[PDB]
TrEMBL record, chain B:
Its cofactor is Mg(2+). It comes from Trypanosoma cruzi. InterPro entries: HGPRT, Hxn_phspho_trans, PRTase-like, PRTase_dom. Converts guanine to guanosine monophosphate, and hypoxanthine to inosine monophosphate. Transfers the 5-phosphoribosyl group from 5-phosphoribosylpyrophosphate onto the purine. Plays a central role in the generation of purine nucleotides through the purine salvage pathway. One of its GO terms (molecular function) is nucleotide binding. This is Hypoxanthine phosphoribosyltransferase. Residues 18-170 form the Phosphoribosyltransferase domain. GO terms for biological process: GMP salvage; guanine salvage; hypoxanthine metabolic process; IMP salvage; purine ribonucleoside salvage. Coiled coil: none annotated.
């Protein structure tokens, strides 16, 4: 890993933490009457970065017998400096309606939270039975708009991280670990 | 693991992991002569959502094990919907963000059956002049073809029974299972009935 200046989490550490958060999530819904087809926990995976976290998370949730429904959404910026409210163009949205469902937005990282805050409100206005967010990494001090994730795997400082779905110029998403990009590389 | 809705388990998580590793090794050896490099020459992985999400996540990591640098592109194509059989029509819900022209592209799919999805995808992408176009499918039902199609890499050939798990679904259900199992017809027939 010559392009990295430090290792934050190895695949093994990530694996364990996800399992813990998944158990928490499962316990938190243990009374919501989740059932396949009619009442699944809807995971709204925000592309592209969360693809890896989502694959591992849904499997950990399955370990706790939580029936899930996978949704993948793709968003795009409208242009440079066009919004501040984190408004984004929806290229791909959920296949089913979330209205009346228990929904969980899945993200790899939250920093400024502009986009995630926007998406949260958006889905909130669609009337799901419930709406929460689970984010792998949280740069708590990076906020440009107040926003709290319901579940977080790890809190991190303002470093540029890569790996485990996270990229730098669409590179390194495939690493099994999360590392800090060497500022000499960036 | 025991699944009430399963007739039987086709492949366990360990089995899939072992097979994906072997296929990734082959892909690495096969692309060695292309000099793939991060930023300038990555192997473009075209992940066919929703089904391919899990295979894609595990495969890109296995490719990373063998130093194959990749660039992920997520597209979304629909054909079966909530049912058990091909609609006969393939819908492109989301296409690539970037052009594949002049790049080495590998389509990553969870299963090839009638081959209408891949046939549609191939014919679409081939016209865009990529440097090369190959396909890796986790599962192949080689005797379900309605149109001919031969993937470059196949992790496993399977019989003609409805399979779920590891990204594969029946009415957007069971994609999260760690193993690939055969769905009991009494389960999907009841659900098809309820839906009908
Ligand atoms: O809270 P914020 O400051 O918005 O930072 C986090 C977001 O930015 C990144 O997405 P990106 O735009 O890089 O898209 P990507 O997931 O496809 O890489 C990351 O994957 C999160 O979605
Ligand atoms: O060879 P074929 O008969 O075309 O069948 C294979 C395709 O059908 C399924 O997709 P589906 O249309 O169910 O979409 P999905 O990935 O979202 O589940 C499967 O994931 C393949 O993409
Ligand atoms: O550190 C980080 N690494 C990758 N993507 C993002 C987005 N925000 N912050 C990031
Ligand atoms: O067995 C099967 N399971 C899930 N999707 C498909 C498509 N074709 N055949 C399938
Ligand atoms: Mg993102
Ligand atoms: Mg990014
Ligand atoms: Mg399907
Ligand atoms: Mn598919």
């Amino acid at each position: 890993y010559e392009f990295a200046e430090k290792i934050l989490f190895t695949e093994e550490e990530i694996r364990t933490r996800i399992k813990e958060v998944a158990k928490r999530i499962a316990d938190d819904y243990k009374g919501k009457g989740l059932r396949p087809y009619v009442n699944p926990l809807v995971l709204i995976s925000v592309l592209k970065g969360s693809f890896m976290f989502t694959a591992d998370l849904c499997r950990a949730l399955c370990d706790f017998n939580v029936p899930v429904r996978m949704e993948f959404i793709c968003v795009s910026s409208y242009g440079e400096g066009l919004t501040s409210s984190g408004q984004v163009r929806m290229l791909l949205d959920t296949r089913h309606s979330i209205e009346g469902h228990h929904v969980l937005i899945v993200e790899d990282i939250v920093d400024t939270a502009l986009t995630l805050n926007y998406l949260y409100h958006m889905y909130f206005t669609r009337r799901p039975a419930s709406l929460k967010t689970v984010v792998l990494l949280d740069k708590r001090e990076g906020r440009r708009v107040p926003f709290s994730a319901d579940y977080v795997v790890a809190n991190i400082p303002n470093a540029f991280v890569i790996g485990y779905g996270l990229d730098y110029d669409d590179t390194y998403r495939e690493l099994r670990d999360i590392v800090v990009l060497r500022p000499e590389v960036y």
